[PDB]
Each structure stands twice: as structure tokens, then as C-alpha cells.
């Protein structure tokens, strides 16, 4: 129908698992289950046509890094996500952006920079201005999100499928 | 009787002959077989229906697991901290949507524990009210099962996850075990409740032998169709008395009327006493046999033979040495046109019956009533370590018999002790019966030796069966099923313990019962075993359950492939360009032939479903007899994770029985190496012989022969492995090329396969080496010669000197693999002696199996046998394997 294999890459504990199930189950989770590789599917019609969204919640433990070179070959849409309360993930997002372009041997590829845990303003270490800084540096679109309050959860995946069609 | 009119139809299709050919048999043993063998069926179908849903599912889908849960040290090291990364697949949406759930778990976890972990992968921290406990605790109960993605194997039993061969193979190959999650109702709803339907024929002085005190006297009356008759009394292959023959009467006068007086005492005839008859012609000396016959002196009711009898003789084989054939069939020829020899046995005016065990153990007292140093006991241990073909001298015979009451300490010497007993003695056969009655249990692989032609005694064979049903696992049973089916011919009666054992186990494990049928239908082209296997297949199909439906589809599918190859060989075959692809593609596109090869289980593997055909790849080979390269689809919804092109070679002309024995020993040789630390990856692909000479060959994807890899001629084999395995994968592909080469080189030297060329050796893109087409083995009228292209790949990339540190370690792998097989020489030699009755060209006499004794150097010590291999390797490779 409309093949769209979405991939959620990022560091550890940045919120890839909470944001992924928020898009389908629409419920925020509080456990810290270190994800390895989980797949989710959801039919959406928010786009101008149908969409077979194949979401892949990837790992961020650095012990499953050999699995990065796999889903970066089959996916057509990525989400560079990080936690605004963790500068470590912020200074490690570009490493994900370099491996994707190196695998596919392309100048650019549809991906959206997501800043998660925006509700924890009392513990934010990466301000908003530093977020759009990496957006212009990586030539991607920046968008803050928060799985705890479900902010820009649908817009994050829907803006990703809009760059895939505008890629071609 | 209305239901029996339907079941009897489909039963005759799978057997290849109508059921009415058995109801018109005047033989009382045949009718008593069909009547009493139903007790095995009733005890089996009532075992498949104890538990209502699971017992039937366990039968159709038995857990294909290893024989031991203990993991080898090097196999356990392949796990991440002793844990396995398995992938759980769950279907959520009714539109067939997929959701994977990877999880790290211990390797020794039961399927109930991995299900509960997948439950956590579906809930995390979700909703639970104080009235919703059992709403979610019911998930942790018996609700879900597990299934391999791509195959039809199920994790129904509570065995550790490592025991399952699929999970075990993923640890070896280093692959992701993808398992699809199902519910119990999703599987149980496809198995009906087959009530046991018994057929219509299931309706409801006599002194002893040891009181006769006379001499055995058998008279030959006349015959039909200078010659004489060679008569002999044998117990398997050993003769009881001197061969007594009749007078040399001229031809065209088949009259004798002579009571052949034998030197055997009537109370001394063992229970397995046999009469061997043959006709020899006299034309220096002129003695040549022509026809032979065998009759057992006791029938199936333990009564002595009496009265007149008409025996129909058999034609002599291509290569027969002795005039009389002791290794007979113990039956008359059902050709009703061959020479028929008439006899007349002694009367005694009473029904002479063989005594029961009560009198045998009673007379065992009369033998004793009628009237230990350490250096001696160490010799009996040196006898058990010898191969079963090692000639036991006469001095060693009395040593084991005089120390018969000590052999209970070393029960592995039992096969050696049984050959040290004069079975023509009513006293020794009575004392040996009491020793076997209380004999300690032995290994199942050692008990199979007591089921070949050398041990025809029923008390000896009954002991080996009781060692199988108590110690033989279903993994080793399916491994050794070909040899166990083969030794059914050595049974002198239809109903026996070995048949009741292999029937009940095949009726309780459908994975075993599948190959139990095809190994019996493949012998139907030979009438000497057609009656035994026909009655046995009739009993199997009577209670095999729903699988009879799928089993008849394979027969119709396979029969639709035999006739096409016959039309392509006997007819046409003149041109091989358009004619090879005209009639071939016209039949595969024919409507009545398409549905014949659609939606039926693979005969090579019942868990593989052969679905839609792909005629674009289906072709006819340019090899011998022009085999058919076929292609199918995997109708499994998870076909993307497993293979998608089921490729099978249909070899019509060439016999595929030599391949099965070689492809099986390679698997057994690999298991012996993996259990000792030798990680020599062998590739024993599937092979199943069908009928006369047709058969199926499992094809491995992305595999190319040595001749298939070339770019003039050069050593491009190393470049092909470099081009396909770049980066850090090159160092692993070269290792796979060396470990598989050392295994396939040290094994063919023990077997003695024919001269292997570049088309006999194939390699994968992964770098694994394996041989194919084992048509000639144990031949003599070396096979794996270390060519230059091998050392260019084995010894790293040294374009000059091949004897480096890499090749120095290649020899050590062969030494550890050669000596390992030598330590299990008794196991492999027993596997060849159990296949001697299969009529194979290279498996006719014991001079062929003795070739294994010389290539293993079983007459030398451990170090002296090592230099033998190094000598023969340095001789085949001129200056290659120096000391
Ligand atoms: N306050 C808050 N916490 C969040 C948010 N998103 C995720 N978390 C929390 O962050 C923790 C770990 O994130 P998780 O949901 O496991 O995402 P992940 O990045 O896939 N984890 P891993 O890479 O370790 O598998 C959890 O405690 C989760 O509740 C958010 O928007 N706000
Ligand atoms: C001669 C022959 C029909 N044969 N005879 C007795 N056993 C075999 C036999 C056994 N195998 C094979 N043939 C085999 C052939 C070809 C092959 O790939 C093809 C594409 C190729 N030309 O590279 C893959 C194979 O793998 C399975 C093992
Ligand atoms: Mg995660």
C-alpha cells in the first residue's frame, strides 16, 4: 500500500520507548526496559493518503551497536531523538546522523531531530536554542516532544512521513 | 463396515497395492499378524488421547530436540554471558500485521519462561485494577505456545530452549532465533479426535522338545522345474552340524526320497534354528549353485515343523561364493513359477513345541547338578574394545565362556560372549538364557549390534529391544531409524518385539512415523520384503491418524515425478535444447499435474510445506540420468525469515541409497566432533531414497562447485572468498573453509569415497566446504586431495610456501578428528553391518566393511595409527604431510 518503515534511534533512556508506544497505545509508560529491537505497526490516514507505518524502537545501550548497520539499510525514515535533560545524548546525536548517511551513501535522508522530556523543565540541560542549532547543522527539522504529556507525538511521526514523500 | 470401505481405499494408495491382497493370504501367521498387531495400535491411539488437546498435538508436532540438555563448552561460549538473543513475533491486527519483540534470556529456559517474558514485552507498566488480577494472570497460565518462523516445528514440551535443534543450530551458525507466538486454540483447532476404527478382520498332547531324544532327520521328496541338494542347519550364519547333502541324481529326474540324517540332536536345536537348502549342479571339481531356499525349523507358535511342505526356491544373487546360502530369507518364493522343492519332516505323532523359559531355567539347574587373578580380567576388557569384525580366536572363545559369570562386571563384552557359545548345545543355550535374563543394561548404540544377522536368537533380540525402549531417545531413534528398519528383515517372524517397538514409537511420534513409512515404501519394489513391509504399512496407516491424508498427497506427488522422468528417458531424449524444455514445461503447466504438486508436506522434511511452484527456475539437469531441479514456495506467513525457495533434486536413474548412508554418517561424525570440542562444521544435506532408484536431494542455496568458480584457469578460489566476505568477515570465512575441509577430508578417507574432482566439491558464499554425490563408497575396484587452490585459501594468502602456521594447525584438526572417529569405530562398523541386507552394491559381504578397519588402523595402537594417517596423507599428497 504505502511502505513507510520508521526508525527511532537515539541514546539510552532518552524516551524512544515511551514515544513509540505513545503513538500506538497512546499511554505513557514509566518503566525503564532497555529496548533491544521492538517493532510496531499502525495504519494512519493523517497524511494525504494511506500509510503503512512500520516503527522500529531501536536500542541505545551501545552493546547492540552491530544492529545499527542493519535497520539503517532497510528504513526510509529516522528520528534522531534525545533528552533535553541529558547533554550526553545531545552530543551523541550526530554519530547516529553520520552512520545513516554513510550506510546509504547519500547527502541527506528524511529524519527529524526530536527533543524529548520537555516537561522536565526543572532538569533541562539542553535549551531550545541549542536544539535548532543542531537542526541547521544536520540540515534537519527540530521539534520538541514530551511523552509524559503527549506533546508533538503524532506530529513527530507525521512530519517524518512528509519528508519521505518530499524526498524522491 | 461403511467407514472401513473408505479408510481401506486410501490405505492401498500409500502402500501401492490393494488391501485385498492380504485378506486372501492362506498363511496363518499373516492373519494373526494383522489381528494381534492392532493391540499395538490400540495402546498407541489411547496414549495419543489421554490428554484431550495436547496429546494429539504432541504426536503430530513432537519437540525436535537434542538428546542431552548439557551444552558443550565451546557451544556455551557462543552465548552472550550464557544468554541467547531470541526474537518473539506476535500478530496483532487481523490484517496480518507483524510486531517483533527481541529479548535476552538464559539459554536453558523452558518455553513457559520465554512466553512470560514476551508478556512483559506486551504490558510494561499497564492497567491493573484490584479486580483485574486473574484477567492478566490468566496470560501466565497455559494459554500460548511457540512456533518456529518458517517451519512447522512447535515448542510444545517443557525442554530447555537449547535442546531444540533450531535454537541449537542458531547458536552454532550465530543467527537470530525468530519464533512466532501462537495460542493453544490456534493449533489445537486443526486436529480432530480420530476414534480408533478397527477393521473387519479384528474379530475374536503337545509335548516339549527336550523329551524327544532323537536325531534330526528331514526327507526331500521331489521337485519341480547331474544335480543334488545341499541341506544345512544354521543359526544365523554359524552352522550347527556338517553340511549333509543328498545323492547326485541326474537332471530332469527331480526325485530323491532320502531322509537326510543330520549330526544335530533334536533337543539341542535352538529357538532360532534354521534349515538352509540349495541346488547345486555337477558337470577336478564342478560345483555351482542355482536356486536356494530357507525354512526355520520352528514356526511363530514355537512348535516344531512336521509333515510335508512345498518350498519355492530363490534365484542366487550376482555374487555368491559358497554353494549353500546361510543368510537367507526364511520364506518361500511367492513367484509360483520357480523350481519348487518338496520335503517331509519327522512326525513324532505329537505336536513338538519348544519349551518355555520355566523348563529352560529348570533344565539349567541340571547342567550344574549333573557335574580369578587380576591379570586374567584385564584381557576381557581388551576384547570388548575390539571392533565387531575383529576375528575372535578359538582360544579366546573358551576364555569368555569359562568366565561367563564374570562378564556381568563388563556388560559391553556381551556381543563378544554370545559368539563364544555353541548354540547347538541344549546345555549352553540354557545357561546363556539365564545370563541374558538378568543382564545389566547397555548403551542403545551397543544394543543395536545384537539386532543384526549375527544374533538371531529371540532371547538375545528381546534384550536389545528392552535396552532401546528404556534408554534410546527419540532423537537417536530418528537418527538410527534407517538401520532399525533395515534389520526388520533379520526377524524370522512377522510379529516380534522389534516390530511392536518401532510401531508404537512411530504411532506416538509422527516425526518418526513419517520416515517410518517412506523407508518401508522404498522397499516395495522387492518382493522378498514386500509381504512384511506391506502388512506393517497397513497396520501403520490403520492408526496413523489424520496424517494418512497428507501422506497420500506425497505419494501421488512423487508418482507424478517418476513417470515424467521415465517419459524423458525412455521416450524423447533425442535432442536436449528445445525437447528438454518442450515436454518438460508442457507437463508442469498441465492443470492435472499442477495441483499434484501444491500444498503437501515435503518428503525430505515433514515440517517443510511445498506450496506454489516456480516454473521459471524449474529445469532439467545435464548430469547423469538428467535429474530434475525443482523449486517451490514457502506458504508460511513468516517465509521472509526462513528460506523461500524449496529446491529439491529428483534423481531418477542413479540409486540414492549410497547417499543416505554417507549423509547420515557425516551427521553422526559431526555430532561426535561437536561433543568433543572439534567445531568442524559438516553439511549433511537431506536425502531420501524412494522406490526403486528415484529419490529426493535437498539443495542448499548460494552454493557453487569448485568448477563453478573460475575467471584461462587460475587460483581464483581465494579471490571469491575475498570478494564475498570483506572487512573482518574474511578472517572468519577462511576459518570456516579450513574447519569444514579438515572434516570432509578426514571423513572421506575413512569412508573411501570415489575420486573427488572439482564438481564433487562445493563451497558456499559463507566459505563452507562440502562434498556431494556419494555414489561410490568403500570402493577399491586419496579421494580428497589437497589441491593448490585449497592451500592458497587455507594457508592464509601465501602464494608460495603452503606449509605455514595455518597449515600446521590444519593437521592437528585432522589428527583430533581422525582419532575421535577411531574411538567410536564400533559404532560406525555396526551401522554398516545393519545395512548389509539392503542389497547395496558396495555393501554385500564383510570384505567391504573391513576396509574401515584398515583405514582406521584398528590393528595398531593410538600412536601407531596416527603415523598411518600421516603416512597415507603424505603419500596421496607428494611431500604434503611430512612428520
Ligand atoms: N518525564 C519524562 N520521562 C520520560 C519521557 N520519555 C521517556 N521518559 C522516561 O525515560 C525513561 C527511559 O526511557 P524509555 O521510555 O525506556 O526510552 P528509550 O530511550 O527507548 N530507553 P533504552 O534506550 O534504554 O531502551 C523511562 O523512565 C521513561 O518513563 C518524557 O517525555 N518525560
Ligand atoms: C550430481 C548431483 C545431481 N547430485 N547427485 C547426488 N547428490 C547430488 C547433489 C547434492 N547436492 C547437489 N547435488 C547440489 C547441486 C547444485 C547446487 O547448486 C546449483 C545451483 C549449482 N550448479 O551450483 C546445490 C547443491 O546442493 C545440494 C547438495
Ligand atoms: Mg528503548
Residue numbers in the entry:
A (entry chain B): 12 to 179
B (entry chain A): 107 to 310, 323 to 343, 353 to 410, 416 to 503, 523 to 862, 872 to 941, 952 to 1053
Publication passage describing the model:
Here, we present structures of KRAS, RRAS2, and MRAS bound to the catalytic subunit (p110α) of PI3Kα, elucidating the interaction interfaces and local conformational changes upon complex formation.
The first set, comprising D203, K204, Q205, K206, Y207, T208, and K210, located on the rβ2-strand of p110α-RBD, engages with residues on the β2-strand and switch-I of RAS. Additionally, D203 and K210 at the ends of this set form salt-bridges with R63 and E74 in the interswitch and switch-II regions of RRAS2, respectively. Structural analysis of the RRAS2-p110α complex indicates that the large, polar side chain of glutamine at position 36 in RRAS2 likely disrupts interactions with the rα1-helix residues (S231 and M232) of p110α-RBD.
